[PDB]
Scaffold this active site. Structure first.
Site, PDB file in Angstrom:
ATOM      1  N   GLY A 105       4.129   6.278  11.117  1.00  0.00           N
ATOM      2  CA  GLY A 105       4.828   5.735   9.948  1.00  0.00           C
ATOM      3  C   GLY A 105       5.517   4.395  10.182  1.00  0.00           C
ATOM      4  O   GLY A 105       6.602   4.119   9.647  1.00  0.00           O
ATOM      5  N   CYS A 112       4.572   1.336   9.322  1.00  0.00           N
ATOM      6  CA  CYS A 112       4.343   0.234   8.401  1.00  0.00           C
ATOM      7  C   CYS A 112       5.664  -0.272   7.848  1.00  0.00           C
ATOM      8  O   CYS A 112       6.609   0.493   7.632  1.00  0.00           O
ATOM      9  CB  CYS A 112       3.438   0.666   7.260  1.00  0.00           C
ATOM     10  SG  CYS A 112       1.745   0.762   7.746  1.00  0.00           S
ATOM     11  N   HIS A 140       0.804  -1.220   0.000  1.00  0.00           N
ATOM     12  CA  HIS A 140       0.000   0.000   0.000  1.00  0.00           C
ATOM     13  C   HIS A 140       0.839   1.274   0.000  1.00  0.00           C
ATOM     14  O   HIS A 140       0.269   2.375  -0.044  1.00  0.00           O
ATOM     15  CB  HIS A 140      -1.018  -0.008   1.154  1.00  0.00           C
ATOM     16  CG  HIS A 140      -0.435   0.081   2.534  1.00  0.00           C
ATOM     17  ND1 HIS A 140       0.104   1.240   3.049  1.00  0.00           N
ATOM     18  CD2 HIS A 140      -0.404  -0.825   3.544  1.00  0.00           C
ATOM     19  CE1 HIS A 140       0.494   1.029   4.297  1.00  0.00           C
ATOM     20  NE2 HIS A 140       0.187  -0.214   4.624  1.00  0.00           N
TER      21      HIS A 140
END
Ligand SMILES: *C(=O)[C@H](C[C@@H]1CCNC1=O)NC(=O)[C@H](CC1CCCCC1)NC(=O)c1cc2ccccc2[nH]1
Ligand SMILES: O=C[C@H](C[C@@H]1CCNC1=O)NC(=O)[C@H](CC1CCCCC1)NC(=O)c1cc2ccccc2[nH]1
EC number: 3.4.19.12
Lengths: 294, 294
Positions: free
Chosen positions: A139, A141, A39
């Site tokens: 942040g 991920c 993503h």
């Protein structure tokens, strides 16, 4: 007794930053491949068509940075929900590693990272509803979960999303999600979670191996009667597999597994009455039989 | 909210194995010196004359292994309760570091090691009675505690012993003990411990800055009245300094410290009554204000 994480050094030398457009997150750099959540190519978030989003990217759309050094992406492909960015340089710090998919109840260490740099390390469990009760930042991920056994790092989790209840969802390192989740910002909810019974029992055994026997009693139980009671407190059913797995700890303490099950039944009925077990006022379920022996 | 340790990579590369005669424990290899507990030279332990025992040793009595490679000891030296073994080679993995002495109530990460090999990492607080509620194996001595501040590793603890209550005692890296303990085998006991008030408040702020509000109320107290309450429950006195250092947390989420003290005052009598706080059912005192904000 401490929830101990694995030393994080082998994983630290693998964390990089990946930027696509306006989005930056973390990537895992092993040999000449960087793994990150697909993503990162989203702008788009309710119904992404990743095949269509990805074919429109070229190598130079992906900015990969390891510390101060920018890596050149020479190729890219998608494997389920992870993006694999081929880079010009092999990671010289690549450890011995494997990719493993874990089952509910398993524990692992999480190296939380931001902008490619490690922030902290902590121990996690895969919940029965396939979520993680993590501590994840704006942040985070691409941060990974892992175990280490004899200098070999087993990567088992990569972080993708936070559910509206505040728990977390992600994939194995082949990009398959844990649980019934998808990388869409659609309404999805984690199933009702349950306590990991086999882990609670392991920890009571740990309590016996160390100090205390105060929670033991004179009763035993059948397996089915234990499960009928324990499910009334939202405990996972205990299976014969779980009984087998607890064998070594039973043998070490001289307390039959079904006798420890009787103790748990009474602890659920009575609570702890102002006492503590290993340091905890609640029944701990994020230590496995394996974790206790180590 | 999870208890998070610092990433341990910078410290892992400093851990070595030190063997002296019959005893094996861990050493810390920085530049061309390995640091380890001076009691490694004991057999003897019930009353040692360390200066005499040391002049009896020579360089070859110390076997230092950095993983596979044996390091040649070319000098030996004592500083308070730590031994300094000069080796022939500077550790190429020496990070930027300093030796610091911490204050009771401050936190740090412990890298538990055995046979010179890092085994696990966890976050600790220095108790008001100068002990550590650690998890330490048979051969864990020489394991270190540390904080990291922007590439610099601040070493603050080296492990020496387990007290009869199962808590732990050690020195700073200049060999000065934390607490009224000595490195000889003798009856020693931890003083009665207290709870770290400023850390409890920070953890409560970590709940309000987060989501929870149910322990909050409309009330406030005085520092004097709160400190009278702290005593009955064996809580550290709250100093005008603590209140100030929390100020950055008060200022942010609109709760004066004495406003949160009124909440803590009532918690010290009512209990939780089935509700967690951050994700726990006991008043947690192992997060500093800095730990919460970071
Ligand atoms: C170093 O590796 C060990 C670490 C201990 C072992 C178990 N858990 C730990 O943290 N250190 C020791 O074993 C010390 C030995 C030195 C102490 C200082 C003087 C010279 C030797 N011993 C103990 O920590 C110890 C012994 C003991 C006996 C009875 C009750 C408690 C107790 N603690
Ligand atoms: O690192 C980036 C974050 C990690 C999140 C953020 C805060 N804490 C975390 O763990 N990922 C993200 O923010 C992605 C966004 C999305 C994922 C699915 C496909 C499209 C992109 N994740 C999300 O967790 C998320 C969005 C959202 C909206 C409403 C309610 C809950 C929500 N959760």
């Amino acid at each position: 007794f401490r929830k101990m994480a694995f030393p994080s050094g082998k994983v630290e030398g693998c964390m990089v930053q990946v930027t696509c457009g306006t989005t930056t997150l973390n990537g895992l750099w092993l040999d000449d491949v960087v793994y990150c959540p697909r993503h990162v190519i989203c702008t788009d978030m309710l119904n992404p068509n990743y095949e269509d989003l990805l074919i429109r990217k070229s190598n130079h759309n992906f900015l990969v940075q390891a510390g101060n050094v920018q890596l050149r992406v020479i190729g890219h492909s998608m494997q389920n929900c992870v993006l694999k960015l081929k880079v010009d340089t092999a990671n010289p710090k690549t450890p011995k590693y494997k990719f493993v998919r874990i089952q509910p109840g398993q524990t692992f260490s999480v190296l939380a990272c931001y902008n490619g740099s490690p922030s902290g390390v902590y121990q996690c469990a895969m919940r029965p509803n396939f979520t993680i009760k993590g501590s994840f930042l704006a942040g985070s991920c691409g941060s990974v979960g892992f175990n280490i056994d004899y200098d070999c790092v087993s990567f088992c989790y990569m972080h993708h999303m936070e559910l509206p209840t505040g728990v977390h969802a992600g994939t194995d390192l082949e990009g398959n999600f844990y649980g019934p989740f998808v990388d869409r910002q659609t309404a999805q909810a984690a199933g009702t979670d349950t306590t990991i019974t086999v882990n609670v029992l392991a920890w009571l055994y740990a309590a016996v191996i160390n100090g205390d026997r105060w929670f033991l009693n004179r009763f035993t139980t059948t397996l089915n009667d234990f499960n009928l009671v324990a499910m009334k407190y939202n405990y996972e059913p205990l299976t014969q597999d779980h009984v087998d797995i607890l064998g070594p700890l039973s043998a070490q303490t001289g307390i039959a597994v079904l006798d420890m099950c009787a103790s748990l039944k009474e602890l659920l009925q009575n609570g702890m009455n102002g006492r503590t077990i290993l340091g905890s006022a609640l029944l701990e379920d994020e230590f496995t039989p394996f974790d206790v022996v180590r």
